[model samples]
Structures are given as structure tokens and as C-alpha cells.
Target chain A: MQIFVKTLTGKTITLEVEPSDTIENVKAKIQDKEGIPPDQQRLIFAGKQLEDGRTLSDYNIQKESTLHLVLR
Target chain B: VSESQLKKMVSKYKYRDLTVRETVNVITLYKDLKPVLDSYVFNDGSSRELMNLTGTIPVPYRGNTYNIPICLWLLDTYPYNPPICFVKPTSSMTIKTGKHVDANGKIYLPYLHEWKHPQSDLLGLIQVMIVVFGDEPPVFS
Candidate 1:
């Protein structure tokens, strides 16, 4: 699955992956590029908290889904 | 510094349009001025690239035209660097660049299509501004 993730700063990054990846995996990718630590990063997908424990399957996320990431 | 020095300093940097304050509402002005007056630098002292004092920039938003007020404290942050204005939560939103107005009522720096939102036709423009008062700290009038 390929997903388009956008930052509050208007920066966009597209990721190609599978539903098996957890929220943590998504966050790791974001943190790597944004230089935001895990604890400081917050991912809001469909207005729900995408925590480390939440898997993509749990959210019923489809392929090419776009999630908004907010970094304080 | 002499008045000329002040003028030169003011012309040195460009200010970004950030927060919005309507003079009609004294309460709102006070609330918004808090960050403008308190913080020495925005974004962890990384505010150098944020503000502009030179009369070269313009307001970022088209639907909302506003008067962006700034001060010496912000101007001195850097003689040449533009002053920073805080607009809608850019770090929390999807707007990358924005425009701001200077003391001369000129668009210091114009940002076109900084952030485009699907919900509204209006795009997002983030600018930074600073406000201060002598003796009395800002409060709701």
C-alpha cells in the first residue's frame, strides 16, 4: 500500500507499505525525516490517536491512505 | 539608539504576519499579545528566519486583511533578519510559507498558496508578529 503523509508545515512524504505496519512504524519514518523524537511526535489519523500499539489493520486503513502528522 | 538608528533597524528586517488582533476587541488584543510580548524568540531561538521588519513583505491571507503591529524588541532580534509573526498554528497545520505586512503597510513578503485546505476555499498563510508596551505588560482592556 502507498500512503501520502503530509506535515503541518506543508511538507509531504509518500510511503509504500503494508497494513501489517503499526502506527509506531509510521511514526518512526516521520521522526527520521522530521528529527522529532517518538515521545514528542503525535500522529492523528481520522481524528484518532495512532499509538505504537495501534496497527493499521486495527484502524481498518485502506491502501494509499493519507494520515496527518502534527509535531509540536 | 538614535531615532535614525531605530528607523534603520526597522528597515533592516521584514516582519511576517502571524497573529490577528482587532482593535475593537480589547480583550482579544491582550490575549494575542501574550506570545508577541513574552517570548524572546519563537521556536526555541530559531526565530531568526521567521521575522521581517523591512517593508518588503505583505500579508499572507487574502480574505483577512489586517494591520500587523511590531516592536523594537522584535526588530532588534536581528538588524537584518525579518521579525517573526505568529499566525494560525502552522506547525499544527499544512501551510508552509506566508506573507506579512510591515509598518509602512506594505507586503513585506508575499506567500502564495502556502497551505491549501480542502475544507475551505481560503488557503492558509502563517506570519509572525511582535507587540510590546512600555511599563505596563499587555492585558485585556
Candidate 2:
């Protein structure tokens, strides 16, 4: 369940995800590393909002999927 | 190389006599020449750890391509101190839609207007491939 994460400073991180986790869970974890103001961050994927409570299985996203994120 | 040497090459080589099309072709190359040289050290250079010209464009000149020979205009300094190079690209992503100072600023190009990078007008790294096809009359292919 490893996933690749990248930050604005060109630093990359990998995290393990559990099947029970949701998109919001990943967002919370990344904020600790990126220092992004939570409110200003946008976790975009496949051109969708990936709302809270939506589980990894709900979107058919795999454990090691790479999500492209950016600060809004 | 020294500024004088670069200037000499630009004048004698880049703007050599021929066709109007050739002049335009050279200027377009000049636009990219600076940035390529900006990364190299004129004294002694290497691109091992750094991202550099990926030997693709310059290799096509073995007469497998046009006769417009391309050479590396290496440099150790920058911008005549016009603006210092940033080690990393800025990420302030807040598009301003910002102050309207221009008398005739068009609203259509929001990115052009709002794009401000502090001191210098930086046209950051754009992906462009200049291919030299056999010396054919310049036509938009």
C-alpha cells in the first residue's frame, strides 16, 4: 500500500495507505510534510473533488496510485 | 566566454548575410541560446547532475540535417547582473487577474497580464524542440 507524494520544494515522499482510508486521510497526512495551509490546498484527481468519506475502493484507486496535488 | 566574445559571435555568426528567412531563423535560435548558455560555466562546464541540453538538437547537424550549424554559446556569468537566476522555480500560483496599470490591457489573456515574477519578466522553461530539417525553404510544417 505505498503511494508517491511530491511537494513544491521538489521533495518526494512515499506513504502506505490502508484500504479503509479515504482521500481526506491522504490529504491530512500530506499536509504534515508539505506545510501547505490546509484551507488553501486542493487535492485534485482525475478532474474531480474527491470529497471526504469517499474510500479508495469507491474511486477504484489502487494503494500505490500517484495523485497529482497542488496548492490553490 | 567573456561578454565581448559572446557579443562577437552573436554579431558575426548569428546575423550573417543571406535571406530574410535566415535572419528570422537566427533570431529565434538566439532567444534560446541565452538560456542554454545561462546554465553552463564559461570557464569549464559539466551537466552531470544538472539538467542540460540533451544532445538531441545539436547532433542532427552531420549533414543529416540543414547546414545551419548550431554551436554551444557557453557562459559562466549571467544577465549582466540584469537578474539573478533562481535555483528553484517560484510557486506562488495566485493568478491576480491583478492591478490594471496598462492603458490598453486586454482581458482575454489573463495569464499574460497577471504573470509577475518579482524583478525580471521570466518566460520560464517552455518545451520547444527546434529541429533542423534538410535546408528546405522555411515553411511552417
Candidate 3:
């Protein structure tokens, strides 16, 4: 499935991932695309911080769902 | 208050070709505490942007108040790196033995060393300084 990640500047990017894709896996993709470290990236969906240990399906993140990225 | 003024000051300091990073940093600081910063007389320094504390900041520690002069130095890579602050001692005040401060008045705080970008800002740093310096400040000698 594909997900939409929105940066602090409001730039949105689409990412391809699987249901089994861990948050860390997605964060690695984001790092390659955005140059932001995974540790500094705070992924928020449904007003909750996405845990690195959890899979995308765990958070109920669906295709085209926008996840906010807050960089520390 | 106007864009021209901000640009003029920025260019005058040779911070040429201002990017979104610097603009956002400036705006965030202004929105956070523009009025309070006015009292600090914001200005640019050699390697950092800074603001001076008009009067001494009284830290109530131990027995008496230590009227300390302070200046907050915002490094060029702000919003990415934490500000470097120092105490500016007057003639009346003598540099006490190393506490949280050095002989040159540079402060040594773990918060600064372990600073996380975008997560930490000047306001938070100030709060930490108050507590750390309050615990055991460089007293008058």
C-alpha cells in the first residue's frame, strides 16, 4: 500500500510500503528522501506517535492517509 | 516589524541569501516572544546572532541574589543547534570559581551538549539555565 507523508513545510510525498513494514522501515525511506534522521522524525497519525517497533497495519494507516512528520 | 527592516539587518550582517530555514527561525522566535525579546535588544554578532539582557538577572540562590549579566548567543545554524549563552560580569562582580560557568563566563550545560534540533529552543534553554545556575551559580569572589 502507499502512504502520504507530510513534512513540516507542508510538502507531501507518497511512499510504497507493505502491511508488514515496520515504522523503522518507513522512517528509513523518509530519511533517504528527506535527509531527516529516523531518531529526529516523529511520525504522528490519529494524534498518536507511531512506534518504531509497530507495523503500519498496527496503526491502521491506510493508503493515501496523511501522516504528519515532526522533526526534532 | 517590516520585511524590509528584517532583510536590511540580515543583509547588513552579511547573512546573505537568507533561506527558508533562517526565515522560519526568525519568525518562530518573533512569534514566541517578540515583546520580551525587544527588551533584550536583539543584535547580530561575529559568529552568532544575540540579544543582551538589559539589566542583571537576579538568581535567588543560597543567601543572596546574584545580579548577573547575560547574553544569549544564537548560532548561525539555529533551529539545528542550540544557542550558546554566557554571563557578562561587571567590574563590581568577581569571577567566582568554576561552578556552571567558566572564567570567561561561558556556561557549561549538558542540555546544550545533548541539544536536539527543532525539539530544543531558546526558551527551553533559558528555563534549564535558571535551574542549573540556581543550583550552584558562579558566586562573587
Candidate 4:
């Protein structure tokens, strides 16, 4: 599944991952692309914070799902 | 088209009459959220044109995914103050006024009552809506 992460400015970054993939992995991947560190990043999807312990399936987040990225 | 409209409203005609700070904030905000410009009527019978996020949100219910149509009224205070939200039913949709939803479709949530920016935003609110509505089912037809 491809989950799209979007910033407030409308820039988007799409990630390819499994349903079982952890949100922490997503955040790690995001850090790989951007210079921002995982500690400074807050990933929100479907109105909830994406926690490291929870997988995408935990929130039922699916393909074409868009996540909002915020800075701490 | 939306970007053009935003510029016209902010940089040119001042349709929304927003300040530089608000303009920058909203331009950064609406560019992604993409709520259309519209009007809302108050309980006092007064009305004002505002940006409206008249869209449906995704929710998982009863082992199936459902789309719940909702309307978010983005007031002038907007980002600073969270927007007013409601369940906007269609011609066929029925109202199910639960503890979370009002008879008039207005929504009440803890996040709304204690809205704090930087930590609170429309996206987060919509996510919260999905969580709440998933359990309560605000509308049924």
C-alpha cells in the first residue's frame, strides 16, 4: 500500500509499505527523505497520532491514505 | 484553481479580509485541506462567508468502512480557534442525535471544547470524529 504524507504547504511524499508496517517505520522512512529527525516529527493520520508501537492496520489506515506531518 | 482563488482572496481582493499572519497561516493551511469558500448562518440569523470543508470522512464500522459526510465551518478566527463541525446529511441520510451529535447536527467533542492550536487542527479533529463516530454512528438512513 502507498500512504501519502502531506505537509501544510501541500508537498507530498508517498511511501510504499505493508499493512503490518509500524507507524514508527513510516516516521523513520520520512526522516530518511527529509532531514528532520524522528524525535522532532509528529505523524498524524485520520486524526490520530501514529505511534511507533501501532501498525498501520491498527488504525485501519489503507492505500491512498493521507497523513498530516507536523513538527514538534 | 484553489490556489488562484486563495491568492485573489488574500493578495488582491481581500475577500476574506485576513491579515498577513492569517493570510500566511491560511495559505499554508487551506492549500492542503482544500475547503471551498462558502457561507454559514449563525443561530442569531446572521451569516458570513467562510471556508467550508464539506467533505466525507472515512470510518471503520461494524467490520466495514463507511463514509460519513460532515461539514466544518472555518470561522474568521479559524486556525487559532478550531472550526465548528456538524454532520451534514444528504437527502437520503437520517439524523441520529447521540451524545456526540446535536439535534441540529452540531458536534461536541472534548478536543473542540479545549481546542489548542499547534496541537489541534482540522485533520486531527476529523480523525477524532472517525473514532467517535465509529462507535456512535451520528447519522443513519
Candidate 5:
């Protein structure tokens, strides 16, 4: 699945992945794109925060869904 | 965050190991403050990104609406914990120390002193600041 990560500063990052991919995996990709630590980043979607060791699908994240990025 | 803007960040779980649903309430408590999410460097020099809600909360005092500029920092333990709030004065102003606010603009309200999860949130804190600061403004022009 492909997701769009957005920042408060109005920047958007693209992530390429699968439903089985872990949140840490998504964070690593974000780190590569944003130069911040995977742990330093936070993911929010569908009004809920994404946690570690969980699959993208586990959060019910799906195609073209946007992931709100909080640099925490 | 509005229903539309919030729709983009929808969910129903913990922020990490804790509260999530609780934040949406804080997000929409008032509308003037702009929401900012980014890295925040701590005093120890370690840096971590956090959400910062910055702007002014109006204090109706002496028959005037004084817009008090303040910033609320949403830490990782927010809702379950209280937000670290400050009276962020602009270049034209300076902090005025009082019983509830300090020389450096750090807040010390009784509300914060007795903060209890679920019972205490950003909205209630701001409301208290508005009232207390109304009696004694936190900053001087």
C-alpha cells in the first residue's frame, strides 16, 4: 500500500509499503525521508496513534490513506 | 482540529502505550490557536518532536479583551498527564510574575497542581489561566 505522511509545516512524504509491514518499518522509511529518528516520529491516522510492533493493516490503514506525522 | 481536519488524522487507540481519544477533545477546545507539531529540544539537550498549540487565549478583564499569547505543549504522556503550558510573550511584551505564573513564564496554577487525568485536560487548564490571568495579567506591555 502507498501512504502519504504530512507534517504541520505543510510538507508531505510518500511511503511505499505492504499491509504486513510493521510500524517500525514505516518509521524507518520516514527517517530516511525526514532525517529524524524512527522513534522520534509519531504516526496518527483515523484519529488514532500508531504504535510499535503493529502491522499497517492492524491499524486498519489502507490504500491512499494519509498518515499524520508528529515529530515526537 | 476540526471534524474535516481531524478526519485526516482519525483513530481510536493510545498515543503510544496510553491515551489517544482524549486528545481530540483538547484539539477542538478552542479555535484561534494554531497547531504545530515538530521536534522540541529539552533542557538536557536531547530533542524530540512534540505537538505545540500556539496563539492567544482571550482574557476578558477590565472591560477589555486581552489576547494573551500562550503555548501548550502536548507531551508524549498528554491527557493521561497535563500539558506543559507557558505564557509566550511577543517582542512587544514581557512576563509579569504572579502567584500562578513565574518570572520565566512557567505556569504554577492550582489547577495544574491538582491535575488529575480525564478530569484535567488542555481546555480546562486554559480556562483556568484565562480567569486567573484576568485578575492578574501574566504579562505586561
Candidate 6:
């Protein structure tokens, strides 16, 4: 599934991840693309934080769901 | 400026790693200043171009119009780091003390001092200047 990640500056990047993939994995992918460290990335969806250990399936995150990446 | 025009302007700088969406944000913020302010883009002998804004704002006293200039220097980490701005004054205009603008016309403001990334932009800065300076027009003496 492909997820859309938008930076605070409104830059969006689409990432392909499996349903079983952990949020940490997604952060790692974003880190690779945006040069922001995974530790510093705060991923938010639906007004809640996406924990690093949680799977996309666990959160019921669907394809094309938008994730906001706020860098600390 | 249209998207194409913004794209063309962005293309002039070879150092920006901005995505298409990020470039659009930059352009949109600049577009809001149109008519209210005249802007110019030029290379500052760096890897990127700088934007300069000029306009006439009414002073508090006698509603006199004074030409003001603002310059924006976008850093590579822009949208993340607030753009560095300066007020450029001409010989005809005498900068007043206690104004946010300094002797060199460098503006020192609380908003800029506590700038929040992704929250601040050129348009907002200009608006704040209009309000701050208008509230207490700089005295000529």
C-alpha cells in the first residue's frame, strides 16, 4: 500500500509500505528521503500520534492516508 | 506568478532540493505580496536567488507615504528555518529609534525572534510590519 507523508512545509512524498510494516520502518523510509532522522520525526495521523512499534494494519491506516511529519 | 513562472524562477537556482510541492508553497507565499508590494528576484552571488520587496506605506503622522524596502534571504533549509529578512532604507528616509527597525534598517521583532518553523512566512512578516510601524510611525526628529 502507498501512504502519503506531508512535511510541515507541505512537501508530500508517497511511500510504498506493506500493511504489516511498523511505523518505525516508515520513519526510516522518510528519513532516507527527507534527510530527517527517524528519531526526530513525529508522525501524526487523525490527530493522534503513530507509535513506532504499531503496524499500519494495527492503526487501521488505509492506502493514501495522509501522515504529517513534524521534525523535532 | 503562475506555477510555470515559479518553476522557472526555482530553476534558476541549482542548489534547491525543494520538491515540486515545496516550491509551490514558496511561490504562493510570495504571490500574496503582489500589488501590495513590488518584488524582485536576483542572484546574491550564492547558489540561490534572493527576493527583495519594496512598497510605500503610510506613516501615522499626516498620513505621509514613505518608501520601505524588505529583503528575504531564503536558506537551503527554508520552510524549516524562517527566511532571514532585513529592512533596507534609502537616503531619503531617516530611520527612527525605538522603532523595530534599527539604524541600519534591520528589523528586530518578537515574532521574528520567536519564529516557528512552517508557521512563519514572508507575507505574515510583511503584515506584521505594516501593523507595527503604522501603530507608531517613526519620528523624523
Please name the candidate that would achieve the greatest DockQ relative to the true structure.
Answer: 1
lDDT of 3 by residue, A1-72 (tens): 777887656668988888689999999999998788899877765324678999877754544556677776
| lDDT, model 3, position B39 | 19
Predicted complex 5: CAPRI docking category: incorrect
| Docking level of model 3 | incorrect
lDDT of 6 by residue, B1-141 (tens): 455554454453444434234545544554433221122222211123433233343344456655455555555455556655555444344546465854334567777887765566555666677678777554353
How far in Å is the alpha carbon of B102 misplaced in model 1? 41
Off-target runs (Cα >4 Å) in candidate 4 are A1-72, B7-34
lDDT tens readout by residue for model 5, A1-72: 677888766677779999799999999888888789987877765334678799876754555656777765
Chain A TM-score, each candidate:
0.81, 0.71, 0.91, 0.90, 0.91, 0.92
Best by TM-score: 5
Instruction: Output the better candidate (2/4) by TM-score.
Output: 4
Model 2 chain B lDDT-worst window of ten? B100-109
What value does the TM-score of chain B take for model 2?
0.17
Error (Å) of candidate 4 at residue B138 is: 0.6
Give one clash count per candidate, in the order shown: 33, 2, 1, 2, 11, 0
> How do all the candidates rank in terms of TM-score, highest first?
5, 4, 6, 3, 1, 2
Clashing pairs in 6: none
For model 2, how does the per-residue alpha-carbon lDDT over A1-72 read when each residue is reduced to its tens digit? 776654345666787887577877877777776667656655543223455678755654444444556665
Share of native interface contacts recovered by each model: 0.00, 0.00, 0.00, 0.00, 0.00, 0.00
Q: What CAPRI class is candidate 2?
A: incorrect
Predicted candidate 4 versus true structure: per-residue lDDT over B35-104, tens digit per residue: 5665454432245676666657777888887677777766676667877787766656665766997644
TM-score of chain B of 6: 0.61
- For each candidate, the alpha-carbon lDDT, in order, equals 0.39, 0.35, 0.59, 0.67, 0.69, 0.58
lDDT tens per residue, model 6, A1-72: 777887656667999998799999999998788788889887876434778999877765655666777766
What tens digits encode model 1's per-residue C-alpha lDDT throughout B22-129? 111222322222222222333221233221221211233334333333232344323222333322211112212223432112223333223222221111222222
Poorest 10 consecutive residues by lDDT, candidate 5 chain B: B8-17
